[PDB]
Symmetry: C3
Subunit: 663 residues, 3 copies
Amino acid sequence: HHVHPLPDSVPESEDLFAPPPRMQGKEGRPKPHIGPNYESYVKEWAKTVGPNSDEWWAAKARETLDWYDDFKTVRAGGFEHGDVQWFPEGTLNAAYNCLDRHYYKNPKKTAIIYEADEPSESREVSYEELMQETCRVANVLKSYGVKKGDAVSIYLPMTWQAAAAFLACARIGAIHSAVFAGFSAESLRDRVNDCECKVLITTDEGRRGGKTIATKQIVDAALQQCPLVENVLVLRRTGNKVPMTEGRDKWWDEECAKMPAYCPCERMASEDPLFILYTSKPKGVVHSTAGYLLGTALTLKYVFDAHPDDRFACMADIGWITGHSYIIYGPLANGITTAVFESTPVYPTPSRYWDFVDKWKATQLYTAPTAIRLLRRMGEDHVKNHDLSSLRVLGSVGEPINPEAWHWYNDFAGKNQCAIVDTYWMTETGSISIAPLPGAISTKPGSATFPFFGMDVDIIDPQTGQVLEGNDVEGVLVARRPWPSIARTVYRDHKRYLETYMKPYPGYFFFGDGAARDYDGYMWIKGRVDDVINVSGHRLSTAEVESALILHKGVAETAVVGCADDLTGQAVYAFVTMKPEFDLKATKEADLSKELAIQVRKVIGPFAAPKKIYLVSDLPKTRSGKIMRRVLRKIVAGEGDQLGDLSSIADPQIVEEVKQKVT
Amino acid sequence: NYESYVKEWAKTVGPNSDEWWAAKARETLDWYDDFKTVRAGGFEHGDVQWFPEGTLNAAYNCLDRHYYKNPKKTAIIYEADEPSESREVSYEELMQETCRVANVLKSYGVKKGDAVSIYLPMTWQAAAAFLACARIGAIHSAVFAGFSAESLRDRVNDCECKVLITTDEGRRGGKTIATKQIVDAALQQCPLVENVLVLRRTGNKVPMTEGRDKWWDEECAKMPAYCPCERMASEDPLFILYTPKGVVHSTAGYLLGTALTLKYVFDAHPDDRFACMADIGWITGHSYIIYGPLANGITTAVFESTPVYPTPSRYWDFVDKWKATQLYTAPTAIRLLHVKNHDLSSLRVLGSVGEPIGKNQCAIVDTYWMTETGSISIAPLPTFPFFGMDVDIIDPQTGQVLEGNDVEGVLVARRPWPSIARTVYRDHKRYLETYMKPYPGYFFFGDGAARMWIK
Amino acid sequence: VHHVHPLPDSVPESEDLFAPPPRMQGKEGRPKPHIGPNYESYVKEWAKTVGPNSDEWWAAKARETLDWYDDFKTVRAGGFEHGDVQWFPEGTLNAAYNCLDRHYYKNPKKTAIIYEADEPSESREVSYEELMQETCRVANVLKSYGVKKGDAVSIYLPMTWQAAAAFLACARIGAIHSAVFAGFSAESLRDRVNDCECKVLITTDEGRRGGKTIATKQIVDAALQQCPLVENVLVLRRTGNKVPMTEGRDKWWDEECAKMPAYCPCERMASEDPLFILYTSTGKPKGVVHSTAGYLLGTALTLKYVFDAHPDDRFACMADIGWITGHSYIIYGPLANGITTAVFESTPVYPTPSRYWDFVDKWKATQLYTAPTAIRLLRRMGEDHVKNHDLSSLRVLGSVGEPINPEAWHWYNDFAGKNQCAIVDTYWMTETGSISIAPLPGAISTKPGSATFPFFGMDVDIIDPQTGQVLEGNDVEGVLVARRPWPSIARTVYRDHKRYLETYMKPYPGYFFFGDGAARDYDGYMWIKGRVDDVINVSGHRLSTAEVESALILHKGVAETAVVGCADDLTGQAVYAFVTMKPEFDLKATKEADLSKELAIQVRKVIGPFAAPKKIYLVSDLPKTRSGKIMRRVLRKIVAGEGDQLGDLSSIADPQIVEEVKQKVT
Ligand SMILES: CC(C)OP(=O)(O)OC[C@H]1O[C@@H](n2cnc3c(N)ncnc32)[C@H](O)[C@@H]1O
Ligand SMILES: CC(C)OP(=O)(O)OC[C@H]1O[C@@H](n2cnc3c(N)ncnc32)[C@H](O)[C@@H]1O
Ligand SMILES: CC(C)OP(=O)(O)OC[C@H]1O[C@@H](n2cnc3c(N)ncnc32)[C@H](O)[C@@H]1O
């Protein structure tokens, strides 16, 4: 075969994982929405793509969401000019679908499990309570002159009221723009200025992992350079003294106390913007309303097999698209219970996730490979002595999951009784693009497997621009047709949207990731196109080399970048982090580096073996867990003085250590 | 009989009452969009909801739909302060004037959800001013024309309106109210008011501030006599009424309440001539001069005078002149009133309201309610709680209901009703503390009662 | 014999009735007419559209013709007296959705606009997809400026195809566009920009017309010096030549639109929400306001029936979008019907007088719609420019703007139509929204110079202006009035409803007053013969301008004429005639004094002794508006010695012509 699976210590013949009994309708669990095999996935998927898929999408849109006005047209527009339309004539409101309609059915049902930074302060928030808070905030925003179509910046940490702030904007047709709490004043300023908002919602302080985030202090520094912001609504999360500017700044509780606990919903067109979400100039990805909401609702239902009484635990942050789609919009649109997790995976101890799961009997868990590798690094004593049997689906999002970490997830979090859904997508796709349906698909460690409903993906040969038909092909991932939750533009920069996604391969949407489809038709997304390394004509994905390195005992996490080489074009350079227990005296660093290189050579080939290996205490990462290989690539290339605004990455101090180790 | 008012009332209260209420809302009002949910929310947090997904317009229900059916029908019997100056105002004329004023307001930049203060005496154009605001989704705040400059200022400032509708002068009991003079005094300390629309009721010289002040007639003459109706959510606010606390009523529930009570408590019929002698500056004039009668498409009276001008026979002269079919007044006026040789036979119902209190023919209906209730809550049907009203007696010393008959305590309501006030403008905390906290789970009217007798 | 006579013609009356020709009979593979084949087929359908039982027809047509977001309940209400006309009031819709989206969803690649550039070689087809995308981009730009539903937006654009996108972007978001003829003076632009109180103006750097540059941005800058409310100007880069741009206020159309997505939601408009203000040229500028559903329905129905438009037709209205004709029969009517419409950027004589016909044969136009002034202009230029063309794709030729003299009607019929097209003489006004009286080409046998019969929904009569009373029967003459509102009637004059009532509704209470003299002949055909204010009363004989001007043009060498009245001690008024001759006419073989005698004799033979002009002035051209109306008021006041009280003539087609006329009279 030309395409190989991501390196794994398990033989390929023993590495296929059928839906386990918890996902077979056994063990008293709900029967899966799609099952029990691959063909059941294909039979339904075939209804969602192609020239006769309007019927399926029209029915799903009308069955899944409540509409004030019906639509007539299912879809129109396309990539070339960026005029994608779905259900254009219909009207709806996201807050109505995420709150009102469920409150009218079961007001006391839990909407949010609020897992506070300190475990003792966690509590359940009913749909009634969440709706009331959302309506109060919406009324406050209207009193500030916020109109349909106005942008509102949100700089809130992971307290449950973040959901109320999102949905209060959606309720009145405002466009919320959420910024990770803890982003520097500079990063906040750039995003507040770009969306041209006049109102900002924030906290006095945030709490995360027992640390205080001085949000109001950061807001005050940023707003000195944000001339349009005239109103700041400040949630009293900690109660510590913070500055408050007379007139501009008001307290959330004092303002909401003046307002009624119900607010009508603004009737939104399907294509009215729902939010702007900046990714790392800052790129404001814009999603509209109906198509995005439908995509998050359908993917949540089908990829995680969500049922009415499920308790869904997405442990990400609402500053990330993962939090937009699979904390707030998806779970609440489905009317189930969703977790707002305010802490870190290791506060107070690395048992936190699992204490949380057993306390609330979470039925699905969704996190990132960085968190899985972090907990794997800390040892099994924190997870082994838990129940965790309420879980039946474990999800991974953010980057390729190394098969080694996949197995740890499968073995310890799931006890070999959960389906693992490796979900590939992007901020720009709105909802999950490629993922196993857990009641249907037998999984391979490291493979997203098959495309979701409405996603028709192909592999293009970047040297020819042509689609590679069939299986056992490798290249760059593209999508053939629009899908309902695709981002509609980049805020006030449609040209950047067209040039980034629609022009590289005309006729297609360009994801920016390298991908392969193996002989069984499974899709493998193996890293960013910009991270590919070419050694003596061999094209290397980051995931395959990083997956080989972690097979060595004691390795916690690695990142590989290319460095120019006069004789091989590029050479692989690897940054490697070891588990805390690994003794760098019994195995001197030079001996360990040799073993790591040998391991890569045996599993991939000599061309992939790192020419140099740097042992570091940690890797530069974004708040969401992405490993910033561009930073490492520029440091190795001697361009460490031209890196840009890294002030809001997870730990800026790590960039200095890496610079020292390389020098 | 008892088995008639109680048989029907059982369908309007309790866990099976949504069916009755959905049918009446759909029979009684014209809707642009249908509702799905009948009711939601409750007293505790003040999130009462009725017909939330529906859309409608109060001006469409009080003017347009009747104008389309019978444009020449009299909407308002305008009984001027001088009896000789009275005249009938047709639904066509009222709708045209309402639309002109609505177009004037839009030309000032009044948007859906904006407050507009109204400082008008009892001339028929007061209805046009109310319904013009409702037509465009503005929130009118009516201020009784007998209020001083300070009381006017306080209410104008509290609601943050940018527009005020008033008159040059008012005429009541043969005397002149210097309304524009009072308005100018008030507006010296009202920094948000940018436009004043001044109805020329007397034509006597009054001060007018260039730019800020314009004449009603001259502004309306520039505008077309039709204006589209803003499609309002059932729970969009309809008006603020300061009682200073701004009692806020929403649209669909309030309008349904007034229309049903008017039809049942007063047994209205399509060609009736309903004469409520109250003032549009108070809820009685809101509900049973303007919104109740015009929603039903009947004829309503706008009485500009006093009970004793020119003489104490004025009420009975008015009833004989117009053949009024109902007469709704307070005991205060009915006691102050010269009634011997009058006919008064056209009257089918004599209503009383506002305080504890025909000659063998016209009925006597004693109606209890409050500004916060929107429409009549307890009354006899020609006593007995109205449809949707489930009231109980509670001992204040225990907070417990005094089940039975011969008990005495405070009056409370069990569940929300459609026309209940939804908040106190920008002071929801006061709304909850006043009405919802004294007896958790109940609505606290604030008066005593015993069995039903209202103390 | 008859009291009412046809407009003077050299063809005998018995040979002057033209039945629908074979191209309009469903033969030769042409589409079958929507109404046909005779007068009775028109009456049978027309009778459903007027009277007390016509709600059914109008409700069905409104629901069949337009896409609605919300249905209506009431068909019509209101009336003339107070100006509260309402049609389909409870319904909601959007004009851009009906003109773009619904057709784009059906056939995105169908041509929406044939853009005939000033230079023929630069012309191209603009698909519904491209037009919708550009409309959506502009709509998004306007929203980014804070334009809200109900805000006015001024448009000062020449006849480039993007003018349609600018109109429809305003309609898409519920803004009220106010389009001003490109080339109007800074003073005229200022007055209209200030009256509508807009805060946004859309224009070009420059326009191109007849090989000439229109300094649109320079004019805008001059005007905006006196327009304190305008905060944003969007400038279309039509030529790319250097023009001033004010930092902050002014932005380039292409740079702004490139930032925006190519789709924009449609604002759900009430039937009676204003769609546009259109200013017309005697006092202050008159902003005629049209609402949405009735206007759109009227333009859609008249286009379909008066021009017998079918799905694949290529409709060529050669007017300007600054004129109501361009509003209704370039943009809204044709695009609502989903067909192809022409945006003609040039003049009838650039590069040569063959332009119209080169255009028709190049694009295979199926209908042509222009004005008598253009027809008379091409007539004066000779037959070599039209004779050697095909023109067989045409089957309907339309004329709008003024009475068409039978002499010009025949030239149109003979050379443009080759006696195989139906001629539709369409009478209406800015204030009527859509065509009011016109032949239905598959049904009505035409008379040269007659509008013939009223359109669906139009119930018209003749009032004797000397009595104020309706004249019953046929063979009557007086002033035209309408008995009942129709869906596309103007709803007000912007912020001046009193002027609307006093101009149209007060002169003849109970009726709508058009302001034109009219006659209904013995066959019931309607003749619109000139403005009431232009009637000339000589010794008790009331003379219409059209009849005398039609008699004069029967003389060899006459190109165009205008007659006005001047007080006369012996006849009350006397006829004075301003005459333009063809360039080739030898004015020395026939001296000016000699020609006048022949003209007077011809008018006497054809009309009567009283109609002979008392004085005749030879002029090189006549004062005319941009749209072709002859400004007889200007001539009338000059003859009356009142040339110093003429008003704002800065924006007429040729202001210099007024100076010559003053000289000739002096
Ligand atoms: C949802 C959230 C992660 O979106 P973004 O923050 O916009 O980042 C999107 C980018 O992340 C990477 N990626 C995310 N998931 C996976 C996965 N399962 N397998 C492989 N690569 C994955 C890709 O490079 C993608 O372009
Ligand atoms: C409708 C209008 C009067 O409302 P408000 O002006 O808010 O005053 C309401 C208050 O008036 C008094 N009341 C009203 N009706 C009656 C009645 N039938 N018998 C005895 N007392 C009555 C009560 O104290 C009530 O709470
Ligand atoms: C549509 C556009 C021309 O409207 P306006 O520019 O408002 O001018 C309207 C005026 O033009 C004249 N008129 C237009 N058409 C004809 C015609 N066929 N026969 C005779 N007179 C006609 C009339 O005097 C009309 O009042």
